[PDB]
Amino acid sequence: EEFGGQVVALVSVAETGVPGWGGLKAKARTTTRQPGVHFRPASSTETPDGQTNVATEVWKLTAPPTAAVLAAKPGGELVYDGTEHPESLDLDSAAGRAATFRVDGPIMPKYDLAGQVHHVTIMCKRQA
Amino acid sequence: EEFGGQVVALVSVAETGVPGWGGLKAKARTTTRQPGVHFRPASSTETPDGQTNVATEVWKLTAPPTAAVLAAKPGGELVYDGTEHPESLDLDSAAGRAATFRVDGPIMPKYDLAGQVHHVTIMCKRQA
Amino acid sequence: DLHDQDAPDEEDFVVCWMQPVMRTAVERDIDAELPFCEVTRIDGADDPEAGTDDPVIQLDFYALGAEAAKAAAKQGHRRMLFLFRNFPTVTLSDGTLADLDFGETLIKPSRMAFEHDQIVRYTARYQLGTSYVAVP
Amino acid sequence: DLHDQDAPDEEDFVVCWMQPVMRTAVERDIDAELPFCEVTRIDGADDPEAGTDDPVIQLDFYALGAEAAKAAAKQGHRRMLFLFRNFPTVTLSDGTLADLDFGETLIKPSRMAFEHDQIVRYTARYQLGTSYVAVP
Amino acid sequence: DLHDQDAPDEEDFVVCWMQPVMRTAVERDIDAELPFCEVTRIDGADDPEAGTDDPVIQLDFYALGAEAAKAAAKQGHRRMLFLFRNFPTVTLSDGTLADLDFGETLIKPSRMAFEHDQIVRYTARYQLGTSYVAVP
Amino acid sequence: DLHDQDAPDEEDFVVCWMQPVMRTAVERDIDAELPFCEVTRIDGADDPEAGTDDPVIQLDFYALGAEAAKAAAKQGHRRMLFLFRNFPTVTLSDGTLADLDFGETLIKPSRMAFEHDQIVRYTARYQLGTSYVAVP
Amino acid sequence: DLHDQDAPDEEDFVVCWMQPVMRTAVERDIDAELPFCEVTRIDGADDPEAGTDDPVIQLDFYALGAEAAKAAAKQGHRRMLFLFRNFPTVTLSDGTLADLDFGETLIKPSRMAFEHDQIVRYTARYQLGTSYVAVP
Amino acid sequence: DLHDQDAPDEEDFVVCWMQPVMRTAVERDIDAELPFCEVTRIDGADDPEAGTDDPVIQLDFYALGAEAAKAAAKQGHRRMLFLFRNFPTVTLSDGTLADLDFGETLIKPSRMAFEHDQIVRYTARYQLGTSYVAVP
Amino acid sequence: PLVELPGEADGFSQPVDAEKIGRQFLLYGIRKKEGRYLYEVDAYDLAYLNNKG
Amino acid sequence: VRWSPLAQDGQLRDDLFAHRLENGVWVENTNPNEGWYLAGAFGEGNGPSSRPS
Amino acid sequence: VRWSPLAQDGQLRDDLFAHRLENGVWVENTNPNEGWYLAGAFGEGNGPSSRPS
């Protein structure tokens, strides 16, 4: 079904390659388009601007139980900028960094009396 | 009666055998199938990804007051993967580890005015 | 490639030594019998050149009631004193034979707080001296 | 303009040395295999005039269960002892060759608390001695 | 098999000594009479070779009102001073006879916080010296 | 049976000495006049063999406003200095006569936090020297 | 009856000395001008026999922005250095004349946290030396 | 009237010295480029008679990712070492010329926690030696 | 040579009257930098026993 | 050059010692050697030092 | 071999001492013995030590 009039682009993370400096490996990313979802801010706070100022936002996403959504894992990203095709965006670009969120917590599915998934709720965060 | 359209496999824990390294004994497990239950996520959080990232989930289970359910003890496990026969699964398998939950807290039964158990609520947790 | 010498495992040593007199393990499950000792290491230092090792070991005693806990602590302390004095040979889980160089008592058993309101926990601390044996 | 000499990177040194025996990185992702060592620096001091550097390095071992964690800690300690004794040459990620002046063990592996209830974390601490090489 | 010598139980010693003058136990139930002393051990050290034991004992006094608490603390301190000076023989619960080697006062009774707003708690700390007697 | 000698009560001594110049008690009720000193003991040590006692006494001054609090603290410090210098005789509540051996100021009055936003609290700390008198 | 000698009030001394160059008081109201110094005492000791007093004084500087706060801290430190060097005479609120024996800087002004996000607080610490003058 | 000599501003000195190689300021706004150093003072002492000043300076490095943060920390440490060795002249914001007496590294760059989960913070600590110049 | 292998000879002995024995000594200092060895060795043609500890 | 502890290649010599330790066993060297004995470990803070007067 | 504190089997001898402690009682040894007396405990940090000069 449809739960809203917004389109988001879930991004998967899968590290690959020979270890680099400090034992870290490069990150390979894959993007998938999921339309017809609802995305709304949940909470937001700020740290006192004594010497360094940090601000955080929390958002909620409700999506149909599609194959791509159910396969998301903690540590992934999703990209949203209020456009119809956000997937065709450069993550390396400054706009991409400004429009990429971080998945917070595990996937939360909702079940019915028939034992079938009805919708999925996901927590997101972004800081500056 | 029936409270939902999901089937879970409660797993009992009973250590046996001669003490091994460090005084720990091997674990012997027994699985029991309990169908017609409701299983839904309760809460989920995450630890800041500074150097190590840890995520936790909390689920709730409501089951009919059967003999097997009432005999569960803290420290046991139950296995759920959205299938009709999850009991015929290998705990040693990676899928088994990914689909095994840990019982959190004691068994919580609910009583009626007749002094009989009506349903049992159980807390579960799983981390990555 | 790894080095060819290492000291015997201290926790396994203490568990295999205390086990004949009372139930002991590195970790206690949610349910077990009261008599119980728990082993841990807090500090140490290893010197490959001189073959010197100075581990520190902690023993926690759990029992129902103050009386039983104190009796278990006394029995454990006496067993440790016997080990310190007579220098016996202890067979590990792996079957290897290991020995000590000396021993010393830092904290005699005292009472510590615990979540359970029936089980009383007593804590004692010990220091050991060990050498390097060849890795098999 | 910057100075022309600096000590080799300690974290990169330790990672490139421990990597052949077990997976190691400065940071652990949310999911990985159990055998795992994590490197960190806590303290140090640099003296340009005498060419003396005294870094302090921490190794954290994560594994499933107490047994596997203890075995991994023992293997890591043996590897570190081999490094301290034989003074081998280690090739960094940048391809440079770096060596040590000495080594010493401050805290032999012990048990520490961790959020995950299945993974057991062991912690060891070491001290190193390094000199200044020319910047390429 | 356990060792054949051990020092007398310090808590039992102090309880059996203070009991004739005032109610005393290792633990206080939820309800009891006001005059009350509580015994505890915080630290010590045992040396089997030299037969030397240095326990540290704490006494807590509970009474209704500041005046009664201070009077009870004074009485307890005087009783402890008598014990330190005259070296009397004390019969334990087990019937064994035990004695002291010396004694010293570390903290003279002072006031400490307590949850109950009517009972006033006073705390004093003492050090003892004990030897090893044969286990019967 | 208790011992026959004990030092005079330090809190009663200080209260009976400061009372002529300003209201003082071991505890302050919920409502009283502003000028007010509170006495407490934090530490000490008693030696029966040598007849030596070294108590530590704390004085807290409460008054409305910073000015009045500072004036009260100055007056109390001057009174304590007079006591330290001239060695006067003080009659306790029990009627006994008690004296000092010496005195020393550890912390001159300073400002400390307090819950009430109008009353200002000043704190000073002193050390005393006392001997043993016969118990009547 | 009180003693006849006492040192001059340290807070009043510092306030009356710093006041000509910048607004200063023992306490800051909820609203005032930015340039502002706050005085406090943390520790000291008085010896009646030798006429020796060693107070410790703290100065807190509040101003809008980092630049103004740093400038105010520099000005205050220079004023304190002038006082330490030239030994001038300071007239108190009471009209009495008071002087110093010496002075020493313990902590040069540094940055500390503050609740307000626009006012920047700088903190410096000083040590003084004072004698006893006759009470008028 | 204020004193006529004062040491050069340490924070301004360090900022004007590190600025040519990387962005640096006493405070970081909510948004800026990653390469970034932050300066602070934690402790010091000034002696007018001998013209001696011993400030302590802290440098914090912020960058995106562990690799960039470590590279920035290495570059900053090399720049500081160059400053310590060659004793160059630094022009402040005010246009004055200032120099150093010596320098010493207390803590070589290590990793510290930070709220942001992408920016990695490295911290280093240094000690300086400065004299008194005439106030213009 | 007269030196025995370890764990072969029994307890030694110190003679009542002894005589000066000449011995040779080499002190080794080995330091490695950038995968290259630097050696510092001292030579002593003759040396007598001076004092114990 | 008459004698030197360093080999022609620049490495150290191997025929210098008389006893060798192999597989935890003290066995005499069968290869030709000058014959030298090696001291073992040294306590921390103490090592080969010279104090001229 | 004339005399040795070690037995032929490799263990220590037992007939060495003259007094024995049994069940907390000091009783003289009835078996044949050379006759030797044993010192008791030693304070910590102090033990059999030799200081040649």
mmCIF file of N, CA and C in Angstrom, chain C residues 55-112:
data_model
loop_
_atom_site.group_PDB
_atom_site.id
_atom_site.type_symbol
_atom_site.label_atom_id
_atom_site.label_comp_id
_atom_site.label_asym_id
_atom_site.label_seq_id
_atom_site.Cartn_x
_atom_site.Cartn_y
_atom_site.Cartn_z
ATOM 1 N N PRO C 55 50.868 -12.344 39.177
ATOM 2 C CA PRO C 55 49.430 -12.118 39.026
ATOM 3 C C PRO C 55 48.740 -11.855 40.355
ATOM 4 N N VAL C 56 47.591 -11.189 40.271
ATOM 5 C CA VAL C 56 46.746 -10.898 41.423
ATOM 6 C C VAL C 56 45.390 -11.550 41.192
ATOM 7 N N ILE C 57 44.924 -12.311 42.179
ATOM 8 C CA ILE C 57 43.734 -13.140 42.042
ATOM 9 C C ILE C 57 42.729 -12.759 43.118
ATOM 10 N N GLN C 58 41.453 -12.733 42.734
ATOM 11 C CA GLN C 58 40.354 -12.393 43.626
ATOM 12 C C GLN C 58 39.409 -13.578 43.746
ATOM 13 N N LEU C 59 38.980 -13.870 44.970
ATOM 14 C CA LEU C 59 38.019 -14.933 45.235
ATOM 15 C C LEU C 59 36.782 -14.333 45.885
ATOM 16 N N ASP C 60 35.617 -14.623 45.316
ATOM 17 C CA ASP C 60 34.335 -14.180 45.846
ATOM 18 C C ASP C 60 33.557 -15.403 46.308
ATOM 19 N N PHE C 61 33.024 -15.347 47.523
ATOM 20 C CA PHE C 61 32.278 -16.455 48.105
ATOM 21 C C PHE C 61 30.818 -16.052 48.257
ATOM 22 N N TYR C 62 29.920 -16.880 47.732
ATOM 23 C CA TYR C 62 28.484 -16.668 47.840
ATOM 24 C C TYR C 62 27.868 -17.825 48.612
ATOM 25 N N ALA C 63 27.009 -17.502 49.574
ATOM 26 C CA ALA C 63 26.294 -18.519 50.330
ATOM 27 C C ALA C 63 25.054 -17.889 50.941
ATOM 28 N N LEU C 64 24.111 -18.745 51.328
ATOM 29 C CA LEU C 64 22.853 -18.284 51.897
ATOM 30 C C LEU C 64 23.043 -17.999 53.381
ATOM 31 N N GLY C 65 22.795 -16.763 53.781
ATOM 32 C CA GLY C 65 22.962 -16.378 55.173
ATOM 33 C C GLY C 65 24.385 -15.970 55.494
ATOM 34 N N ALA C 66 24.523 -15.175 56.554
ATOM 35 C CA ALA C 66 25.843 -14.710 56.967
ATOM 36 C C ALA C 66 26.698 -15.862 57.482
ATOM 37 N N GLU C 67 26.090 -16.769 58.249
ATOM 38 C CA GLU C 67 26.839 -17.857 58.870
ATOM 39 C C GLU C 67 27.492 -18.754 57.826
ATOM 40 N N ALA C 68 26.708 -19.200 56.844
ATOM 41 C CA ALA C 68 27.234 -20.090 55.815
ATOM 42 C C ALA C 68 28.297 -19.390 54.981
ATOM 43 N N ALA C 69 28.078 -18.109 54.673
ATOM 44 C CA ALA C 69 29.060 -17.359 53.898
ATOM 45 C C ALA C 69 30.381 -17.248 54.644
ATOM 46 N N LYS C 70 30.324 -16.945 55.940
ATOM 47 C CA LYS C 70 31.545 -16.837 56.729
ATOM 48 C C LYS C 70 32.253 -18.181 56.831
ATOM 49 N N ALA C 71 31.488 -19.261 57.010
ATOM 50 C CA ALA C 71 32.099 -20.586 57.073
ATOM 51 C C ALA C 71 32.783 -20.943 55.759
ATOM 52 N N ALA C 72 32.129 -20.647 54.634
ATOM 53 C CA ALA C 72 32.734 -20.913 53.334
ATOM 54 C C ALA C 72 33.993 -20.082 53.134
ATOM 55 N N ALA C 73 33.967 -18.818 53.557
ATOM 56 C CA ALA C 73 35.150 -17.973 53.430
ATOM 57 C C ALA C 73 36.302 -18.515 54.266
ATOM 58 N N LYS C 74 36.007 -18.972 55.484
ATOM 59 C CA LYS C 74 37.046 -19.551 56.328
ATOM 60 C C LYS C 74 37.638 -20.799 55.685
ATOM 61 N N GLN C 75 36.779 -21.663 55.142
ATOM 62 C CA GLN C 75 37.270 -22.875 54.494
ATOM 63 C C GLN C 75 38.141 -22.541 53.289
ATOM 64 N N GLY C 76 37.710 -21.576 52.474
ATOM 65 C CA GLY C 76 38.505 -21.186 51.321
ATOM 66 C C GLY C 76 39.847 -20.596 51.709
ATOM 67 N N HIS C 77 39.864 -19.762 52.749
ATOM 68 C CA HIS C 77 41.126 -19.192 53.203
ATOM 69 C C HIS C 77 42.062 -20.274 53.720
ATOM 70 N N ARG C 78 41.525 -21.258 54.448
ATOM 71 C CA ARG C 78 42.366 -22.353 54.920
ATOM 72 C C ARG C 78 42.932 -23.157 53.755
ATOM 73 N N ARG C 79 42.118 -23.402 52.728
ATOM 74 C CA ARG C 79 42.607 -24.127 51.559
ATOM 75 C C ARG C 79 43.720 -23.350 50.862
ATOM 76 N N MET C 80 43.537 -22.035 50.716
ATOM 77 C CA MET C 80 44.578 -21.209 50.114
ATOM 78 C C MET C 80 45.854 -21.220 50.945
ATOM 79 N N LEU C 81 45.727 -21.187 52.273
ATOM 80 C CA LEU C 81 46.911 -21.234 53.127
ATOM 81 C C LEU C 81 47.645 -22.560 52.972
ATOM 82 N N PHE C 82 46.895 -23.659 52.881
ATOM 83 C CA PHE C 82 47.510 -24.959 52.636
ATOM 84 C C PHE C 82 48.282 -24.948 51.322
ATOM 85 N N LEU C 83 47.676 -24.377 50.279
ATOM 86 C CA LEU C 83 48.353 -24.283 48.987
ATOM 87 C C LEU C 83 49.627 -23.455 49.095
ATOM 88 N N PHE C 84 49.560 -22.326 49.804
ATOM 89 C CA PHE C 84 50.733 -21.468 49.944
ATOM 90 C C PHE C 84 51.851 -22.176 50.691
ATOM 91 N N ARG C 85 51.501 -22.993 51.684
ATOM 92 C CA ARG C 85 52.528 -23.569 52.545
ATOM 93 C C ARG C 85 53.165 -24.804 51.919
ATOM 94 N N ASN C 86 52.356 -25.765 51.475
ATOM 95 C CA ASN C 86 52.912 -27.063 51.113
ATOM 96 C C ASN C 86 53.377 -27.162 49.665
ATOM 97 N N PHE C 87 53.083 -26.170 48.831
ATOM 98 C CA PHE C 87 53.471 -26.168 47.424
ATOM 99 C C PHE C 87 53.112 -27.473 46.709
ATOM 100 N N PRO C 88 51.831 -27.806 46.604
ATOM 101 C CA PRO C 88 51.446 -29.041 45.919
ATOM 102 C C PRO C 88 51.384 -28.854 44.411
ATOM 103 N N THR C 89 51.346 -29.984 43.712
ATOM 104 C CA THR C 89 51.230 -29.991 42.261
ATOM 105 C C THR C 89 49.763 -30.073 41.860
ATOM 106 N N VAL C 90 49.370 -29.233 40.907
ATOM 107 C CA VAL C 90 47.982 -29.121 40.475
ATOM 108 C C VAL C 90 47.900 -29.490 39.002
ATOM 109 N N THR C 91 46.956 -30.365 38.666
ATOM 110 C CA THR C 91 46.731 -30.780 37.288
ATOM 111 C C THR C 91 45.614 -29.935 36.690
ATOM 112 N N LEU C 92 45.906 -29.272 35.576
ATOM 113 C CA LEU C 92 44.950 -28.381 34.943
ATOM 114 C C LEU C 92 43.927 -29.180 34.140
ATOM 115 N N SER C 93 43.008 -28.461 33.491
ATOM 116 C CA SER C 93 42.064 -29.112 32.592
ATOM 117 C C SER C 93 42.782 -29.730 31.401
ATOM 118 N N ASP C 94 43.822 -29.058 30.905
ATOM 119 C CA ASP C 94 44.597 -29.556 29.777
ATOM 120 C C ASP C 94 45.480 -30.740 30.141
ATOM 121 N N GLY C 95 45.602 -31.068 31.427
ATOM 122 C CA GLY C 95 46.445 -32.153 31.873
ATOM 123 C C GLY C 95 47.863 -31.760 32.223
ATOM 124 N N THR C 96 48.254 -30.515 31.970
ATOM 125 C CA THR C 96 49.596 -30.067 32.292
ATOM 126 C C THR C 96 49.769 -29.939 33.804
ATOM 127 N N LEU C 97 51.011 -30.082 34.252
ATOM 128 C CA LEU C 97 51.365 -29.914 35.653
ATOM 129 C C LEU C 97 51.970 -28.533 35.863
ATOM 130 N N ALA C 98 51.471 -27.820 36.870
ATOM 131 C CA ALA C 98 51.913 -26.464 37.151
ATOM 132 C C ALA C 98 52.134 -26.299 38.646
ATOM 133 N N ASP C 99 53.026 -25.374 38.999
ATOM 134 C CA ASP C 99 53.401 -25.134 40.385
ATOM 135 C C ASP C 99 53.497 -23.635 40.630
ATOM 136 N N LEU C 100 53.751 -23.277 41.885
ATOM 137 C CA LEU C 100 53.866 -21.888 42.302
ATOM 138 C C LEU C 100 55.286 -21.583 42.755
ATOM 139 N N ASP C 101 55.600 -20.292 42.855
ATOM 140 C CA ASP C 101 56.860 -19.857 43.442
ATOM 141 C C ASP C 101 56.693 -19.355 44.866
ATOM 142 N N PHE C 102 55.601 -18.653 45.149
ATOM 143 C CA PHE C 102 55.298 -18.186 46.495
ATOM 144 C C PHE C 102 53.835 -17.767 46.532
ATOM 145 N N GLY C 103 53.441 -17.146 47.638
ATOM 146 C CA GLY C 103 52.085 -16.660 47.787
ATOM 147 C C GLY C 103 51.984 -15.727 48.966
ATOM 148 N N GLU C 104 50.992 -14.842 48.918
ATOM 149 C CA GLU C 104 50.827 -13.836 49.956
ATOM 150 C C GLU C 104 49.378 -13.376 49.969
ATOM 151 N N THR C 105 48.866 -13.126 51.169
ATOM 152 C CA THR C 105 47.485 -12.709 51.364
ATOM 153 C C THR C 105 47.438 -11.193 51.498
ATOM 154 N N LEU C 106 46.685 -10.542 50.614
ATOM 155 C CA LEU C 106 46.566 -9.092 50.660
ATOM 156 C C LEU C 106 45.370 -8.633 51.483
ATOM 157 N N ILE C 107 44.185 -9.181 51.220
ATOM 158 C CA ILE C 107 42.974 -8.815 51.948
ATOM 159 C C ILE C 107 42.339 -10.093 52.479
ATOM 160 N N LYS C 108 42.257 -10.216 53.799
ATOM 161 C CA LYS C 108 41.541 -11.324 54.403
ATOM 162 C C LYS C 108 40.040 -11.133 54.176
ATOM 163 N N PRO C 109 39.275 -12.237 54.015
ATOM 164 C CA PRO C 109 37.847 -12.122 53.675
ATOM 165 C C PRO C 109 37.058 -11.100 54.481
ATOM 166 N N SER C 110 36.337 -10.233 53.773
ATOM 167 C CA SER C 110 35.485 -9.206 54.355
ATOM 168 C C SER C 110 34.139 -9.221 53.637
ATOM 169 N N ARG C 111 33.201 -8.419 54.131
ATOM 170 C CA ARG C 111 31.839 -8.401 53.618
ATOM 171 C C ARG C 111 31.660 -7.287 52.595
ATOM 172 N N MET C 112 30.979 -7.609 51.496
ATOM 173 C CA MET C 112 30.690 -6.659 50.433
ATOM 174 C C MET C 112 29.205 -6.704 50.100
#
